[PDB]
Amino acid sequence: AHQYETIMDECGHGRFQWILFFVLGLALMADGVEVFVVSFALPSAEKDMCLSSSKKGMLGMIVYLGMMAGAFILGGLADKLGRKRVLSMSLAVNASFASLSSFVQGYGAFLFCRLISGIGIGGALPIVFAYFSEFLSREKRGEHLSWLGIFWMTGGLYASAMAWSIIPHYGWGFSMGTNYHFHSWRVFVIVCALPCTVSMVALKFMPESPRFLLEMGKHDEAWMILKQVHDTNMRAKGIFKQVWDNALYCVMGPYRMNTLILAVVWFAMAFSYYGLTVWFPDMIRYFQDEEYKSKMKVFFGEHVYGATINFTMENQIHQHGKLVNDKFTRMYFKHVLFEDTFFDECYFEDVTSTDTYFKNCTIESTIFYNTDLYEHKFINCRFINSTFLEQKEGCHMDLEQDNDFLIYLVSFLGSLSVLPGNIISALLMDRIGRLKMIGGSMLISAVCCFFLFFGNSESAMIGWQCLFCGTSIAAWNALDVITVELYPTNQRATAFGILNGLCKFGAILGNTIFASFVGITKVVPILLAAASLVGGGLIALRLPETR
Amino acid sequence: NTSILNLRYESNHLIDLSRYASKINIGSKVNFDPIDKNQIQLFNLESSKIEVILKNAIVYNSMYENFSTSFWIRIPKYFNSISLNNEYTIINCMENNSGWKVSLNYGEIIWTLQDTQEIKQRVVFKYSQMINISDYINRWIFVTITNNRLNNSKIYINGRLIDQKPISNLGNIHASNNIMFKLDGCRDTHRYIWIKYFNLFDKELNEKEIKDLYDNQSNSGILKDFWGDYLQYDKPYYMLNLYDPNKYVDVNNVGIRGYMYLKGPRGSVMTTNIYLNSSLYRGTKFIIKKYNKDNIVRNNDRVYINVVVKNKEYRLATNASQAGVEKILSALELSQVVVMKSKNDQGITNKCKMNLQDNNGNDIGFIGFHQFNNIAKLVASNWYNRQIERSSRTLGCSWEFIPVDDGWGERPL
Numbered sequence: 001a002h003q004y005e006t007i008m009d010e011c012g013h014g015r016f017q018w019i020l021f022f023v024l025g026l027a028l029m030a031d032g033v034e035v036f037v038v039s040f041a042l043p044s045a046e047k048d049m050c051l052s053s054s055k056k057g058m059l060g061m062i063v064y065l066g067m068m069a070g071a072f073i074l075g076g077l078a079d080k081l082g083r084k085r086v087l088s089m090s091l092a093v094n095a096s097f098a099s100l101s102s103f104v105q106g107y108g109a110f111l112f113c114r115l116i117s118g119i120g121i122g123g124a125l126p127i128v129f130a131y132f133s134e135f136l137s138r139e140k141r142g143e144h145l146s147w148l149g150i151f152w153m154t155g156g157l158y159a160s161a162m163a164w165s166i167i168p169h170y171g172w173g174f175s176m177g178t179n180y181h182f183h184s185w186r187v188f189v190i191v192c193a194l195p196c197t198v199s200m201v202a203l204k205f206m207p208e209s210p211r212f213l214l215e216m217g218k219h220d221e222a223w224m225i226l227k228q229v230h231d232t233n234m235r236a237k238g239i240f241k242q243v244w245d246n247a248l249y250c251v252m253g254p255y256r257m258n259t260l261i262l263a264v265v266w267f268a269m270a271f272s273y274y275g276l277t278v279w280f281p282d283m284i285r286y287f288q289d290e291e292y293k294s295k296m297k298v299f300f301g302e303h304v305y306g307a308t309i310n311f312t313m314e315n316q317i318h319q320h321g322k323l324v325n326d327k328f329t330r331m332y333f334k335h336v337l338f339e340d341t342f343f344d345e346c347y348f349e350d351v352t353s354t355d356t357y358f359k360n361c362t363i364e365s366t367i368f369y370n371t372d373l374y375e376h377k378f379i380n381c382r383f384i385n386s387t388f389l390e391q392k393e394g395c396h397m398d399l400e401q402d403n404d405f406l407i408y409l410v411s412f413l414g415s416l417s418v419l420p421g422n423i424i425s426a427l428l429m430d431r432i433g434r435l436k437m438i439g440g441s442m443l444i445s446a447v448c449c450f451f452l453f454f455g456n457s458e459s460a461m462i463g464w465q466c467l468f469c470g471t472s473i474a475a476w477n478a479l480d481v482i483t484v485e486l487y488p489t490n491q492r493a494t495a496f497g498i499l500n501g502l503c504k505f506g507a508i509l510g511n512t513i514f515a516s517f518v519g520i521t522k523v524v525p526i527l528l529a530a531a532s533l534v535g536g537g538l539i540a541l542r543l544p545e546t547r
Numbered sequence: 548n549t550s551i552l553n554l555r556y557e558s559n560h561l562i563d564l565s566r567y568a569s570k571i572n573i574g575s576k577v578n579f580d581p582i583d584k585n586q587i588q589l590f591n592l593e594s595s596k597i598e599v600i601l602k603n604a605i606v607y608n609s610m611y612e613n614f615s616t617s618f619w620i621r622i623p624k625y626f627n628s629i630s631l632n633n634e635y636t637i638i639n640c641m642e643n644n645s646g647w648k649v650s651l652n653y654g655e656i657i658w659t660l661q662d663t664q665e666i667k668q669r670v671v672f673k674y675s676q677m678i679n680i681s682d683y684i685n686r687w688i689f690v691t692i693t694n695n696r697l698n699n700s701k702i703y704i705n706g707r708l709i710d711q712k713p714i715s716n717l718g719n720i721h722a723s724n725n726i727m728f729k730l731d732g733c734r735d736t737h738r739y740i741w742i743k744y745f746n747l748f749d750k751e752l753n754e755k756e757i758k759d760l761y762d763n764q765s766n767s768g769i770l771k772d773f774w775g776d777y778l779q780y781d782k783p784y785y786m787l788n789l790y791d792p793n794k795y796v797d798v799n800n801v802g803i804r805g806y807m808y809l810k811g812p813r814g815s816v817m818t819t820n821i822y823l824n825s826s827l828y829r830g831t832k833f834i835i836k837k838y839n840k841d842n843i844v845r846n847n848d849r850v851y852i853n854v855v856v857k858n859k860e861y862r863l864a865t866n867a868s869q870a871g872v873e874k875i876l877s878a879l880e881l882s883q884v885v886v887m888k889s890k891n892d893q894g895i896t897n898k899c900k901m902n903l904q905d906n907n908g909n910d911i912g913f914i915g916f917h918q919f920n921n922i923a924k925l926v927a928s929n930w931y932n933r934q935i936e937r938s939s940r941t942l943g944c945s946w947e948f949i950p951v952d953d954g955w956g957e958r959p960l
């Protein structure tokens with residue numbers, strides 16, 4: 001290892017490592033966009049198309065579980081088979097099955113295709129980090145690896161920035177009775193497979209891992225790749241049994257305490273971070289919903305005679321109303337409720353309704369012509385001498401007012417807020433170290449979390465999200481470096497894969513618990529997240545030193 | 548005919564045309580239809596009643612003598628829930644709880660017999676008020692009822708057997724000397740019925756005799772609207788197409804270049820737990836104009852058709868120079884004469900139909916709809932004029948005229 005380290009040191013940093021860094025940041029971008037499309041796209045696709053008060057459908061989450069298997073199937077296998085071949089196969093299957101998911105009719109087939117795509121991509125992050133860890137200089141190892149992390153975050157940003165441009169209309173998932181148009185989700189799925197496609201184009205030129213190749217044998221090929229790297233830098237500057245036993249050799253053996261501590265830290269961070277990142281948009285939506293619900297107008301004992309209604313009335317309830325000889329023509333019903341109201345010869349024409357519901361109403365001598373007030377909008381209502389003429393078909397809502405553009409923009413800001421907080425960790429990990437950074441960042445993020453109870457506002461919530469995300473990226477970067485630096489080259493991919501699988505498991509746990517505790521309490525999830533961060537940042541000190 | 552009771556209206560006199568000449572008593576609240584005085588309207592009032600005093604020799608008192616009755620009845624739609632489970636006599640011939648009655652109920656017509664030993668029998672006919680297009684709601688129906696004292700008693704609707712039940716156990720029957728056309732026990736206050744051509748026979752009716760009576764009393768020589776009344780000139784009639792009852796007529800771009808098509812669905816009229824039907828008062832209204840001093844349109848009559856659009860009357864017409872057999876119909880401020888057809892070649896009848904002809908008498912053809920492009924435009928085809936040779940559903944020229952009426956409930960827009 002000494003001679004290989006010396007020749008790698010003599011090779012230095014130049015054109016080749018930068019080109020490889022770009023073609024690997026492409027795969028990290030793919031991982032980021034997968035996390036986005038699983039946590040903020042699928043959950044806002046099963047929302048009911050015809051209700052402005054629909055709740056996120058937490059059904060897509062199963063693909064996360066698939067990622068788990070990938071992170072152990074395509075993560076541990078590479079250490080026994082290869083790093084370029086495994087990454088090639090994984091990203092190839094991800095891209096192919098995403099493209100197949102694009103041309104799919106029905107939600108079940110699309111979800112299955114997304115699940116297998118997650119299977120393919122969940123084994124990309126361990127392989128890319130292990131790949132790039134066997135190419136850069138030993139002294140200048142913490143910096144460049146840290147830089148790679150930013151690509152990951154950039155992924156989410158890009159995946160967010162385009163999403164609100166293409167599909168700012170929820171309900172596109174649970175709807176197959178629509179025409180061949182409305183396929184904005186189809187083109188979105190097509191274009192979200194762009195970084196992986198470009199990475200697949202690029203990886204044909206990059207060579208295999210020299211250290212792994214030397215480990216297996218054929219040292220002449222290792223010498224050839226070392227000579228090629230040196231020449232490029234000069235010109236610029238002028239078996240499953242074996243893999244399971246290998247995984248067990250990473251846990252219940254000489255590597256016993258280190259792996260346990262690393263797993264604990266990874267679970268804690270992937271719990272708190274992947275819980276809060278989805279909690280914040282949900283909390284902002286709940287705040288807006290509460291502000292809406294405050295301005296509810298209660299109406300009692302009305303007598304509306306001979307009135308023609310032409311405007312839009314919203315957020316009202318009527319009780320014991322007596323609407324006699326009224327007329328609703330070309331108007332919008334928004335979050336308005338009728339109870340115990342007695343209609344009389346009213347006329348409904350070109351009225352478009354959203355979340356309105358008639359209850360116990362006596363409707364007499366009316367005409368419902370050119371309307372979308374279907375039968376399901378009437379609950380325990382008695383018609384008298386009434387009629388129901390031709391009715392519009394289609395889910396008609398004022399999409400301009402009820403869309404997902406404050407859930408993608410918030411995610412964009414949250415992913416953006418880490419960019420200043422990542423550079424101050426890139427050109428610092430060679431000075432403070434690799435264990436003080438993770439603990440300090442974890443504890444500081446915990447302190448920031450304990451301040452969130454104070455804040456209650458849109459600006460306050462977005463500010464706290466930005467602060468937490470900014471101080472919770474150095475932790476991730478130091479975690480990646482400390483988890484890639486410990487294990488040797490014969491166990492690095494496997495251990496990184498199991499840790500990434502545990503990270504995805506924590507992501508499932510957090511994105512379920514935090515997103516479920518909305519509207520019931522605020523101190524419970526915040527206290528739980530602060531406890532997780534404090535525990536992780538207190539345990540992460542008890543790790544072997546690497547410097 | 549040679550009936551025993553032949554209640555008919557001749558020369559402002561409701562009399563029994565039979566040789567026995569039973570006595571007739573008419574109440575002060577018994578309305579009569581002006582255009583056809585045979586149709587009698589009965590209300591739910593004390594004086595809205597008709598009484599028939601029968602002869603002594605024709606009072607039914609026996610245990611073996613078969614007999615039958617026949618009448619046309621029209622029952623306006625039931626509206627309020629009180630009518631449910633409320634059975635009201637409309638024709639009563641019981642004395643001492645012995646005799647026969649004809650009663651009604653929510654979607655039910657009931658013929659009831661009771662002997663001197665209080666053994667009670669009913670034969671019923673049921674129709675649903677939850678149907679797209681009803682052939683019995685508010686429309687004239689020909690109810691005949693036969694009683695053979697040995698085997699069974701049967702009830703036929705429109706010349707077709709509907710029900711039969713045994714009366715063999717029934718003993719001696721002593722019916723009343725008076726027939727009482729009145730509503731009794733009708734909780735609903737506004738209920739009324741239409742009755743016409745009440746005839747009685749002292750023998751059972753075979754199927755052939757019933758069909759002959761139906762053909763005779765149908766009056767095929769005069770066209771009929773949807774309800775079954777007499778079709779009239781200068782009266783606004785909505786259109787219905789029998790092949791596609793879920794689609795109504797509409798006009799577009801009035802003028803020579805314009806066209807009328809059909810768009811659906813018609814809609815719905817619903818009262819919960821009472822009825823749910825397809826809306827009838829839809830589409831562009833048609834009016835029949837003369838080319839007889841009365842306003843009754845009979846068979847083999849040449850007329851004009853007017854379409855009423857925005858309260859303005861356009862003439863129905865077409866040019867025969869266009870390509871194809873179809874001559875897509877149009878509305879104008881040419882070929883316009885329309886012959887009204889009700890009776891087919893010899894005796895067949897396929898409802899009211901219109902035959903467009905040219906100014907020189909050539910037959911342009913029967914008026915129906917054709918799927919010329921994705922819009923079903925009205926055409927005057929000679930294919931329909933040749934399809935009727937099989938006496939089947941022409942699925943074309945079968946049009947029904949729907950005037951406005953108080954017995955349906957729906958109000959026009």
Ligand SMILES: *[C@@H]1O[C@H](CO[C@@H]2O[C@@H](C)[C@@H](O)[C@@H](O)[C@@H]2O)[C@@H](O[C@@H]2O[C@H](CO)[C@@H](O[C@@H]3O[C@H](CO[C@H]4O[C@H](CO)[C@@H](O)[C@H](O)[C@@H]4O)[C@@H](O)[C@H](O)[C@@H]3O)[C@H](O)[C@H]2NC(C)=O)[C@H](O)[C@H]1NC(C)=O
Pocket residue numbers: 384385623626627737738953954955956957958
């Ligand atoms: C549901 O609808 C039915 C019938 O549908 C109505 O049809 C027409 C009549 C319009 O009223 C539409 O708006 C409706 O859709 C209703 O039953 C009818 O109720 C009315 C009101 O009581 C009854 O009208 C009666 O008419 C009698 C005769 O009127 C005489 O005088 C007028 C001029 O004033 C003249 O035009 C007419 O020709 C007569 O000469 C009158 O004496 C009496 O007082 C009463 O007003 C009508 O008979 C009812 N029809 C039936 C079939 O019962 C229901 O009330 C309505 N609601 C419910 C809950 O069912």
Ligand SMILES: *[C@@H]1O[C@H](CO[C@H]2O[C@@H](C)[C@@H](O)[C@@H](O)[C@@H]2O)[C@@H](O[C@@H]2O[C@H](CO)[C@@H](O)[C@H](O)[C@H]2NC(C)=O)[C@H](O)[C@H]1NC(C)=O
Pocket residue numbers: 319320321340341342343360361362
């Ligand atoms: C549904 O409403 C009915 C009646 O309420 C009517 O009151 C009018 C003033 C008007 O607002 C009209 O729109 C409305 O429908 C309720 O029935 C009533 O219940 C009370 C209490 O038992 C009785 O005292 C009344 O006699 C009775 N009236 C009728 C007409 O039934 C009914 O209970 C209600 N249903 C529910 C569960 O809300």
Ligand SMILES: *[C@@H]1O[C@H](CO)[C@@H](O)[C@H](O)[C@H]1NC(C)=O
Pocket residue numbers: 310311
């Ligand atoms: C309100 O009603 C008036 C009267 O018909 C009409 O002129 C106006 O256009 C209506 N308002 C709107 C926004 O259409």
